[PDB]
Design a protein around this ligand. Sequence first.
Ligand SMILES: [Zn+2]
Ligand SMILES: [Zn+2]
Length: 74
Amino acid sequence: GSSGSSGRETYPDAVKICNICHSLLIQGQSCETCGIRMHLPCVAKYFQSNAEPRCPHCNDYWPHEIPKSGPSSG
Ligand SMILES: [Zn+2]
Ligand SMILES: [Zn+2]
């Protein structure tokens, strides 16, 4: 016998991954429709110069607001 189990999700970079760059993030924007996090400069870069933003995952609608971009990439 001497069996064992574990019910805890503990990963170094397997908990909150971006949807634009796919990089471990901590603070940003998440979707309540499906459940995906995105960086600040990532969410905007995807919802820049548009009318109605759509989650890059479920593709329904962005419940949160759209962040601003920086002087980078242009
Ligand atoms: Zn990102
Ligand atoms: Zn979504």
